[PDB]
């Protein structure tokens, strides 16, 4: 099951940050709210006119109850750096962290500053995000929480077209070729996060549908030419070694594995099931397997 | 996608309490503390408590140690009386969920918050939970508006992966019993009224290929779900999703007709809203929000 971190730490992060009458979702750490810069809009903008046209004043902030008041402000990127009177009484230890395709993390969904809904997501090679995110919830933000110290890693800015989502991470840099503009863009094609779905296919394995297993052998090379055929990340020799736990645990190795995917991406699965689906699943980190 | 609530109002409710060498999650509301009866571990548990000193309850808060002033049991849980009022505490209810209705489970080990996800009370009065060794004691709620509805405490994993566990008064949900058994649930069964919530959900997202002209009644579509194993459906059952029947246009028994034809000729490799299968742990309400 996708389980996400325990949002606490970060709600008493969520602001609301107004311009006029356009309302989107801020982070507040210490003295500092960091929003998507867009607030102040809208296609081609040039966003230092805008920005050198906005007094301290234009910016309401509302934290809960509170009103809180722009000292300053600046802009990092796509992000604005607000400088507020007040120091956050509920900061958490944190960090801010460029999350790697492959990797996940949570997100916590944000409308008119109110927390909604916390859910696991991750980033996906074409540096887009398969994420839930309605009208309003820019500035919603995911992360990683590790012991107490909390890793900001997105900012959501963006929908294409095409459903799926785009962000940046805390210094205001886009994952991926999007920029804030009101324009339809177009990610690369989505090629399936090799590392996950041999994760998955171990899971698999742990839970007794060993059917897809076979006694044929692969070299790494040949493993990775056809993957790349079928749109799939070549696997590393790093990747591997991360099989490695779920390896000994299950006594089929590596290479014995990705013979086994490399099967089923080249004759599909004659409308069979591994743990319930047609599909090979390719969110489950090798970390959230043994986990569970 | 599955959404849970924000955890934060409960992750300041969760503490450790350990008796001896055994340890457990407890939620911590106003002075009392609430957790699985088995810390203090076929025995009696009227026995067990009655040898059982305050001084001998180790609970904390993080950091923070708290003094047992007294306790009781209700059910399967003890009540720990505490000298220290939690400060966190926000507004709450107790409630007994039904099957086919969803909540938040923050998933706890030693006191300290890991998890969190939905799930599902499922009709045979499990839920298909992902609970580890030490996670005894984390709890399940909703948290519409700013109350939380605290409606589960986690106590077992059955052989066959799925959990069990009790409401806040303690009694069970279901026929288990608190003891070191293997137990059976009964068969489980599928939310029909989750399932046509979930193919309104996709109608609104634009997946409408299993939608077709028939329509059928309820007596026919339940002959049908009987043989599939999944819930009868009612006239309360078809109230309830009027006002996505509205907002869809397409009316309940329609989407009835085009359930049964996912039932008879199942999917052919088709999915809806990403899944192979049809999901039955989102609500009508859900869907809403
Ligand atoms: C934030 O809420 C905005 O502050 C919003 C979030 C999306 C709305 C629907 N789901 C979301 O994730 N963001 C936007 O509306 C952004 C604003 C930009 C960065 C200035 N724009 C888009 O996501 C956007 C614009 C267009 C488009 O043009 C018009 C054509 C097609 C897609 C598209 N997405
Ligand atoms: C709590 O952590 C208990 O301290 C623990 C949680 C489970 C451990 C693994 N995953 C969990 O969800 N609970 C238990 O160990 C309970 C304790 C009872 C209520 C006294 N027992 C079981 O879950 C249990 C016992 C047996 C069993 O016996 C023999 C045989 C098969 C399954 C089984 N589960």
């Given at each position: 099951?996708?389980?996400a971190?325990?949002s ?98 949570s997100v916590l969904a ?7 809904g916390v859910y ?173």
């Amino acid at each position: 099951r996708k389980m996400a971190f325990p949002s606490g730490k970060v709600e008493g992060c969520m602001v609301q940050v107004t311009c006029g009458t356009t309302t989107l979702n801020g982070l507040w750490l210490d003295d500092t709210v960091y929003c998507p810069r867009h607030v102040i809009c809208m296609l081609n903008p040039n966003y230092e006119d805008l920005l050198i046209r906005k007094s301290n004043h234009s910016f309401l902030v509302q934290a809960g109850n509170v009103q809180l008041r722009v000292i300053g402000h600046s802009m990092q990127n796509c992000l604005l750096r607000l400088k507020v009177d007040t120091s956050n009484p509920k900061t958490p230890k944190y960090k801010f962290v460029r999350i790697q395709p492959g990797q996940t993390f949570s997100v916590l969904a944000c409308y008119n500053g109110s927390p909604s809904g916390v859910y696991q997501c991750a980033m996906r090679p074409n540096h887009t995000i398969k994420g839930s995110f309605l009208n309003g919830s820019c500035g919603s933000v995911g992360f990683n929480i590790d012991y107490d110290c909390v890793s900001f890693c997105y900012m959501h800015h963006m929908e294409l077209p095409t459903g799926v989502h785009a962000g940046t991470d805390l210094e205001g840099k886009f994952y991926g070729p999007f920029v804030d503009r009101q324009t339809a863009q177009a990610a690369g094609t989505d090629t399936t996060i090799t590392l996950n779905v041999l994760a998955w296919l171990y899971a698999a394995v742990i839970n007794g549908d060993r059917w897809f297993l076979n006694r044929f052998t692969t070299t790494l090379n040949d493993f990775n030419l056809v993957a790349m055929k079928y749109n799939y990340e070549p696997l590393t020799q790093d990747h591997v070694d991360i099989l490695g736990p779920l390896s000994a645990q299950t006594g089929i190795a590596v290479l014995d594995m990705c013979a086994a995917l490399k099967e089923l991406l080249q004759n599909g699965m004659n409308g069979r099931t591994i743990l319930g689906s047609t599909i090979l699943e390719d969110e489950f980190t090798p970390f959230d397997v043994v986990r569970q």
